[PDB]
């Protein structure tokens, strides 16, 4: 092939030649420049004024090769900075790519899917603009087959990823009608057997559940929670990660939505998640637990029954610090909403020592959270006349020294809560 | 991070 390593000037000469074949060769040359891994000359191509020509080439139904080459070139310009994606949009590329979704050539429709994904992937405005130009119908139409397994694998993965970008980003979140339009195809993809399709389908579900209760409800109503819990149990980390993010988002919703997570068996997975060697999995699983322990007493009881309190003591005892912070939150929520017996159970599991040990941390917020937890636990002891026995417990593990020291802490609410503890239980 | 990329470059094949 003689389209390798052209200068931009030669590409321009060829595209401006009025010779469809010369234009094709020059466009292919541009594609090859633009697809090189080391510093593709995107800005030089834009500056040469080539985007309008590429976009025009997208419409050449009689020359499918130049449709393809221009589609690939524009895809890679659009894969760049916001300014570069904006140059592609400003050239009129969105409707041209949407028109290419119906190409009889799979490699060309796939390229148009990819390009629209990059454009939508830029942010809420371009996502919403792609939707307004009517991208969703033809995209969904590409997946309207009896069995996803008959579609080419790379093709399906590209469609799934682009759809996930139509679900992605907030301020604002995607249009409600668009989410409703996309969800049933999404649910179908979530039941597919390809790991990459599953991963990106969950990411899309996690985006859709990252919002107000009404947004969570739209997803939960589709009955996907059992499938999410199943994926929560996958051996493939790229699958577990978004399944866990989705589930965590869902339990930030109402008690009833959280209950749907519990009913589907999610808690049985947490012994592994809370000891997972991947730090982000542990952190997100602990975050998720904190939102479940902020729930009703019967839900806290579900946490107990599944044996998850010892795992919370574990994470509080030893974990990356951010995971420990989430654990501290899980404990404060638990002690806030729990029955006396549930709080007593917490203490019997050994929560006090690691909670005290974390009071030496240089983080003011976790200090507040822990002091709040200790206050709640003391309240339960008061309701059992056992504050003395708690005081002794705290003093024996060096907790009292730390609380006493916190009175000299510069943060107001800290030396207040601490002075109060000292003056109320350690006199 | 561990999320899908927002944009994808179709590299030299």
Author numbering:
A (entry chain E): 71 to 497
B (entry chain C): 881 to 893
What does the literature reporting this entry say, word for word?
Among the NS proteins, NS5 is the largest (103 kDa, 900 amino acids) and the most conserved with a sequence identity of around 70% among the four serotypes. It contains methyltransferase (MTase) and putative guanylyltransferase activities at its N-terminal region, and the C-terminal region carries out RNA-dependent RNA polymerase (RdRp) activity. The importin-alpha recognition of basic-residue-rich nuclear localization signal (NLS) on NS5 facilitates its passage across the nuclear pore complex. In this study the structures of Impα bound to DENV2 and 3 C-terminal NLS regions of NS5 provided a structural basis for differential nuclear localization.
GST-DENV2865-900 and GST-DENV3865-900 (Kd = 4.53 ± 0.61 μM and 0.66 ± 0.16 μM, respectively) bound stronger to Impα than GST-DENV1865-899 and GST-DENV4865-901 (Kd = 53.96 ± 6.59 μM and 18.54 ± 5.13 μM, respectively). Since this is the only variant residue close to the binding interface between the two structures and since this residue does not contact Impα, the analysis of both DENV2 and 3 NS5 C-terminal NLSs will be combined. One exception is that the side chain of Y882 from DENV2 NS5 hydrogen bonds with the side chain of E354 of Impα while in DENV3 NS5 it forms hydrogen bonds with Impα E354 and R315. The DENV2 and 3 C-terminal 18 residues follow the consensus XXKR(^DE)(R/K), and is a class 2 NLS responsible for the nuclear localization of the NS5.
